[PDB]
Design a protein around this ligand. Structure first.
Ligand SMILES: *[C@@H]1O[C@H](CO)[C@@H](O)[C@H](O)[C@H]1NC(C)=O
Ligand SMILES: *[C@@H]1O[C@H](CO)[C@@H](O)[C@H](O)[C@H]1NC(C)=O
Lengths: 48, 48
């Protein structure tokens, strides 16, 4: 080669995604007290 | 007067209840309740 080109190119890399948390008692039940109980048997899964 | 609440009971080695806490009294008791423990390490904790 007798010449050259100075090339600037982009590389797009994702680094982080959106952090999220879930209230099970709010998702599984709207505000039902009757659903808040009988959800106590599934509390270990929601802590997981 | 009693109210409908969730509470965490600690049983000792002999089977007697010692040092209960009342969940949904303050958020510290709530994260004690969701951790199934009475010792809470330093950090940020999501509650309901
Ligand atoms: C190299 O390329 C540049 C850009 O086209 C030009 O200005 C320059 O004269 C070239 N050099 C040679 C030695 O051909
Ligand atoms: C359990 O009972 C034994 C025998 O009375 C006693 O020595 C021991 O301290 C008790 N353990 C407790 C209170 O954690």
């Amino acid at each position: 080669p007798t010449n050259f080109t100075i090339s600037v190119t982009t590389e797009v890399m994702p680094v982080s995604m959106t952090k999220t948390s879930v209230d099970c008692t709010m998702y599984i039940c709207g505000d039902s007290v009757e659903c808040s109980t009988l959800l106590l048997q599934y509390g270990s899964f929601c802590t997981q | 007067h009693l109210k409908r609440r969730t509470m965490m009971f600690k049983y000792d080695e002999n089977g007697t209840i010692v040092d209960a806490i009342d969940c949904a009294l303050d958020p510290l008791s709530e994260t004690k309740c969701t951790l199934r423990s009475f010792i809470v390490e330093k950090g940020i904790y999501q509650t309901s």
